[PDB]
Amino acid sequence: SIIVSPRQRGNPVLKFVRNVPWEFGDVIPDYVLGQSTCALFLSLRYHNLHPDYIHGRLQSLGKNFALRVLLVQVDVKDPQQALKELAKMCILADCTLILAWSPEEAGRYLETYKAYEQKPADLLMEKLEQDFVSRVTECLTTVKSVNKTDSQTLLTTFGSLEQLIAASREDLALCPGLGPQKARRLFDVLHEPFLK
Amino acid sequence: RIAMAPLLEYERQLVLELLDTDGLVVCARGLGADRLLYHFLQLHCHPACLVLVLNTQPAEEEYFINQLKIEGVEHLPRRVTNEITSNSRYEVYTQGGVIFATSRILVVDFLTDRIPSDLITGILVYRAHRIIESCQEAFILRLFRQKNKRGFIKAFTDNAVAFDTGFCHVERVMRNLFVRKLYLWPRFHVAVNSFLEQHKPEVVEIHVSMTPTMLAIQTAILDILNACLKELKCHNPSLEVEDLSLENAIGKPFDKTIRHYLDPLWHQLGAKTKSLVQDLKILRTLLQYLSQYDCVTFLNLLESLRATEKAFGQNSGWLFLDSSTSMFINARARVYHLPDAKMSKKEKISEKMEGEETKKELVLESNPKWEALTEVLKEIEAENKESEALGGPGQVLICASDDRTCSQLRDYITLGAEAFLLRLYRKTFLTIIHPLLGCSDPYALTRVLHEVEPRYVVLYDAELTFVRQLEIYRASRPGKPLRVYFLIYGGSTEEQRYLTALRKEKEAFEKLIREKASMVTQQSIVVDMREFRSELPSLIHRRGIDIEPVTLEVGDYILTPEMCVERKSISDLIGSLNNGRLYSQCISMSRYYKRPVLLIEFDPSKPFSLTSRGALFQEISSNDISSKLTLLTLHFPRLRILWCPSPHATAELFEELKQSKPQPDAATALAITADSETLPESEKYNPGPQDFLLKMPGVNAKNCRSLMHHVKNIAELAALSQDELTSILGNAANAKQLYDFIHTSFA
């Protein structure tokens, strides 16, 4: 239920939304996204035309909503100045600057901000850590430089930690493409005394 | 008489030029460039003067230290490391002398200004090719040039290939190293050839023709590599120089060009090229594996490549391991015979049909290097024997590339030829030999060379660096001519690898001479140690805002009492948004500091769109970078994002941002830390087993500390019973988990 305020009549972004229907309503920021999420849409070519248009509009919004969003769209080949101005003109007024590289990407942003109020499904880096081969490849890679593929080719020769812990240094030197240095490294690691 | 000792006349000139006017000397493939440095070190090594040697490595020290020690000079060079009790402890500088150092431990001392910069007399760089990329050294020098009066720099260096690389003009390296002149000195120079001819060692080049069944492996491996390189070239139009032709994919320095070309923005490549690069690496190590190792092991290695499909699927590709089956048949012929059956019966010839009960046996073959070696070592004993006492006893130090070869070669002579085929086949079902190369100390074989004066020397395929070292060994004029015996496979990879690279140097030095003949209230920012490896602190310091260095745990820079910046590029964003570590970082940053930001650096030439356009045209737009970015910004309302186009713009954006705010202080910035990690001196070898032992299933910090404090090493964890582990830990479920993990197979 996104609310698009009527000052976006001739705008090239409303044609590129597809997911959720929209509404027309006299709210002060232009795109109201559910609750406590307002957007503001600005192309940098318009910023070079009227330079006093963003700084006036920031004042009338105030501190109403809890998450404000300023998304800007770049289409000017010299962006190394206006971005450095807009960051300092946004930091003191508490917004969030999102850069969009093309008008089609604004459709994904406008839909993605609407259709998300979900749970933290990104937190656990160990989201797939519940299987045996994942545990051995997450345990063995703690040494200095041994990638996953050498752990695969170490798995498919013995399979057993009891067998791997009893092999000689020359017995572990039959490495397919690992090298003698990593073999000597792991042979020192897997048995060296902790204390003195 | 040790090492370079007395320098030969060709050297004597070079030292003369570099004692008056400073510059950088471009020597040629170990023609002795190292040696020069010995002479400088002894001369300035007196006690009351100092200089720093900039880019050494650990072991070399050892040889240099011991050699100069033999002469008996006092105040021998001292070495400084990170673990030296930090400031105050480094009082060695006052005491003076030559001092070795690492690139970092310096930068910190100079910035805090603890070292005396009044007294420092000069700087002797080494391995200058490394300074080509604008990294830590540049900072060490531009920081040094405040001793404008006395300080003298010098650039002994080698590896002429790097400078020859396109887009890295020497002048740029020249201007950075702060020296005026240039001293080329190659190995066709007019005064370095007339001396090295008066005494020359004799070669006895011997051509050894390879078997008719080796070419059937080699011309197939090169065809598969040639078919892989075009597919790498098509789906990546970026890399187009110095990594294109076949010539350059055979030599040893090929992976450095790929690791320089594909390390910026690795994580926007996809899934096709990321397997293809691994394919190219394993196909390059196959071509070296066959020649330097025995046939039995190679039949194993090619058969061990077949086993990473039936468990892991496309591990080493589904593209090349199910095409060109001539490799197998060549491979299969070496070790096992083909099927055989009959009974006076016509139309009786099959693939695998039983008369055919016994496993057919194919004789093992021997690569003719072993055969043509034993003519030379039986000639040379008679060249002894015939000489009797009159010639003298003589010694031979036959040499080989790698340690494992040395092992085999050792046995080929000790037991006998049929011994290996019997010994190897079983398991799977005077004369000193030292290896030529390693990540080991390069300054070693030379020690052995002076060690055992070799009358006759015999060399398995080797790289330039050795061959030339031997001519310099011809420094004693009267000594009988050491006779080297090259060995060459006729029309092969090692001869290609040798010849090309030799030509590569020849063009390389030449272009140089043509470039020599063409010349005629203040603020602060607390900086994190780990971040010094990037050009941004060298661009902050130019504008005037001063930098003080210490370690951190939460965020890269601290611009002001209430701000914290964590810089991440466009590839590390894609990485740390799918790996899942930025979410475990901002939860700490917003907890600790007031207003967290993050700085994203795109690139204005190639904008990655961060969205699949067709999936945006079709799907509901989930599981991308944009959706996971929006979901990150939705939770934190107080995060700020700063986009910046280039690392020259960040130095401007930083000085505009702290305009009227106070100055962040170092005090207690280290104090905030975080609450974890226990105590690290618990294990004498703490930095080894722990890292493993913690990732094991069934452990916690408390039980791990106790159990580690009880049992000795990680071997007996698989040996001791589960009852012992559940008694020493008092828990049953995680103990049974550990016993199930430590004792299992794969299925």
Q: In angstroms, rounded to a whole number, what is the distance separating the alpha carbons of residues A61 and A81?
A: 25
- Tokens 């039983």, located at residue: B354
Q: In angstroms, rounded to a whole number, what is the distance separating the alpha carbons of residues B658 and B560?
A: 7
What amino acid occupies position B99? I
Q: Are B604 and B593 in contact (CB under 8 A)?
A: no
Q: Indicate if the alpha-carbon torsion angle B461, B463, B467, B470 is positive or negative.
A: negative
Q: Are A99 and B643 in contact (CB under 8 A)?
A: yes
Q: In angstroms, rounded to a whole number, what is the distance separating the alpha carbons of residues A185 and A190?
A: 9
Backbone phi and psi for residue B104, each to the nearest 5 degrees, phi listed first? -75, -65
Contact A79 B645 (CB under 8 A): yes
Q: In angstroms, rounded to a whole number, what is the distance separating the alpha carbons of residues A111 and A101?
A: 16
Token pair for residue B399? 């040499």
Q: In angstroms, rounded to a whole number, what is the distance separating the alpha carbons of residues B31 and A164?
A: 46
Token pair for residue B532? 């010094």
Contact B714 A108 (CB under 8 A): no
Rama region for B527: left / alpha / beta (φ>0; ψ in -120 to 50; rest)? beta
Q: In angstroms, rounded to a whole number, what is the distance separating the alpha carbons of residues B738 and B747?
A: 19
Contact B580 A97 (CB under 8 A): no
B269: how many CB neighbours lie within 10 A of its CB?
Answer: 15
Nearest Cα to B233, choosing from B252, B218, B248? B248
Q: In angstroms, rounded to a whole number, what is the distance separating the alpha carbons of residues B540 and B652?
A: 9
Method for this entry: cryo-EM
User: Residues preceding discontinuities in chain B at C–N > 2.5 Å?
Assistant: 354, 429, 520
Q: CA B167, B173, B175: angle at the middle one, nearest 5? A: 125
In chain A, where the domains are located:
1-120, 121-196
Rama region for B471: left / alpha / beta (φ>0; ψ in -120 to 50; rest)? alpha
Contact A108 B626 (CB under 8 A): yes
Token pair for residue B5? 């000792």
Contact B746 A156 (CB under 8 A): yes
A27: how many CB neighbours lie within 10 A of its CB?
Answer: 15
Instruction: Tell me which chain A residues have a C-beta less than 8 angstroms from the C-beta of B742.
Output: 161-162
Give the Å distances, CA to CA, from A51 to A8, B90, B143.
19, 57, 42
Tell me which residue in A84, A132, A153 faces B649 most closely, judged by beta carbons.
A84
Q: CA B549, B552, B557: angle at the middle one, nearest 5? A: 70
In this complex, is the C-beta atom of B615 within 8 Å of any C-beta atom belonging to chain A?
A: no
Cβ-based neighbours of B676, under 8 Å, separated by 6 or more: none
Contact B713 A153 (CB under 8 A): no
- Radius of gyration from C-alpha coordinates of chain B: 32
What length does chain B have? 747
Tell me which residue in B285, B621, B718 faces A111 most closely, judged by beta carbons.
B621
Instruction: Tell me which chain B residues have a C-beta less than 8 angstroms from the C-beta of A137.
Output: none
Contact B643 A97 (CB under 8 A): yes
Q: Are B36 and B3 in contact (CB under 8 A)?
A: no
Q: Are strands A37-39 and A31-33 parallel, antiparallel or unpaired?
A: antiparallel
Half-sphere exposure of residue B337: CA atoms within 13 angstroms, side-chain side: 10
Contact A165 B714 (CB under 8 A): yes
What amino acid occupies position A129? E
Give the Å distances, CA to CA, from B88 to B75, B94, B95, B669.
21, 11, 13, 22
Contact A160 B744 (CB under 8 A): yes
Contact A79 B609 (CB under 8 A): no
In this complex, is the C-beta atom of B611 within 8 Å of any C-beta atom belonging to chain A?
A: yes
Cβ-based neighbours of B153, under 8 Å, separated by 6 or more: B22, B122, B123, B124, B125, B141, B177, B178, B179
- Tokens 């490799």, located at residue: B327
Tell me which residue in A87, A105, A190 faces B653 most closely, judged by beta carbons.
A87
Instruction: Tell me which chain A residues have a C-beta less than 8 angstroms from the C-beta of B626.
Output: 105, 108-109, 112
Measure B637 CA to nearest chain A CA, in Å: 6
Nearest Cα to B24, choosing from B36, B38, B10? B36
Nearest Cα to B188, choosing from B505, B515, B469? B505
Q: Are B223 and B324 in contact (CB under 8 A)?
A: yes
Residue in A with minimal Cα distance to B618:
A18
Strands (E), B450-545: 456-458, 483-485, 487-489, 524-528
Q: Are B634 and A33 in contact (CB under 8 A)?
A: no
Q: Which CATH number fits domain A121-196: 3.40.50.720, 1.10.150.20, 2.60.40.1930, 1.10.10.10?
A: 1.10.150.20
Instruction: Tell me which chain A residues have a C-beta less than 8 angstroms from the C-beta of B640.
Output: 90-91, 96-97
Residue in B with minimal Cα distance to A158:
B745
In this complex, is the C-beta atom of B666 within 8 Å of any C-beta atom belonging to chain A?
A: no
Instruction: Tell me which chain A residues have a C-beta less than 8 angstroms from the C-beta of B692.
Output: 139-140, 142-143, 189-190
Contact B616 A91 (CB under 8 A): no
- Tokens 């957007």, located at residue: A39
Q: In angstroms, rounded to a whole number, what is the distance separating the alpha carbons of residues A153 and B551?
A: 38
Nearest Cα to B580, choosing from B614, B516, B631, B534? B631
- Tokens 């997450």, located at residue: A138
Question: b/e for B299-314, b at 16 or more Cβ within 10 A?
Answer: bbbbebbeebeeeeee
Contact B657 A159 (CB under 8 A): no
In this complex, is the C-beta atom of B662 within 8 Å of any C-beta atom belonging to chain A?
A: no
Token pair for residue B58? 């650990």
Nearest Cα to B528, choosing from B502, B500, B559? B559
Tell me which residue in A135, A139, A194 faces B686 most closely, judged by beta carbons.
A194
Question: b/e for B465-503, b at 16 or more Cβ within 10 A?
Answer: ebbbbbbbbbeeeeeeebbbbbbbbeebbbeebbeebee
Instruction: Tell me which chain A residues have a C-beta less than 8 angstroms from the C-beta of B744.
Output: 132, 159-160
Tell me which residue in A98, A115, A192 faces B688 most closely, judged by beta carbons.
A192
Q: In angstroms, rounded to a whole number, what is the distance separating the alpha carbons of residues B189 and B195?
A: 11
Tell me which residue in A101, A123, A193 faces B580 most closely, judged by beta carbons.
A123
Backbone phi and psi for residue B595, each to the nearest 5 degrees, phi listed first? -125, 100
Query: Contacts from A182-186 at CB under 8 Å and sequence distance 24+?
Result: A182/A143, A182/A145, A182/A146, A182/A150, A185/A143, A185/A144, A185/A146, A186/A143, A186/A146
Token pair for residue B514? 């043509």
Nearest Cα to A69, choosing from A30, A26, A103? A30
Q: In angstroms, rounded to a whole number, what is the distance separating the alpha carbons of residues B535 and B206?
A: 52
Q: Are A159 and B745 in contact (CB under 8 A)?
A: yes
Cβ-based neighbours of B127, under 8 Å, separated by 6 or more: B55, B157, B158, B159
E strand or H helix that includes residue B98 = strand B97-100
Q: CATH 3.40.50.10130: does it fit domain A1-120?
A: yes
Q: Indicate if the alpha-carbon torsion angle B62, B63, B64, B68 is positive or negative.
A: positive
Measure B498 CA to nearest chain A CA, in Å: 23
- Radius of gyration from C-alpha coordinates of chain A: 28
Q: Are B466 and B486 in contact (CB under 8 A)?
A: no
Q: Are B531 and B563 in contact (CB under 8 A)?
A: no
Instruction: Tell me which chain B residues have a C-beta less than 8 angstroms from the C-beta of A140.
Output: 692
Contact A123 B697 (CB under 8 A): no
Best probe of the A interface among B286, B428, B595, B621, by most A CBs < 10 A, is: B621
Helix/strand/coil (H/E/C) assignment for every residue in chain A = CEEECCCCCCCCCHHHCCCCCEEECCCCCCEEECCCEEECEEEHHHHHHCCCCHHHHHHHHCCCCCEECEEEECCCCCCCCHHHHHHHHHHCCCCCEEEECCCCHHHHHHHHHHCCCCCCCCCCCCCCCCCHHHHHHHHHHHCCCCCHHHHHHHHCCCCCHHHHCCCCCCHHHCCCCCCHHHHHHHHHHCCCCCCC
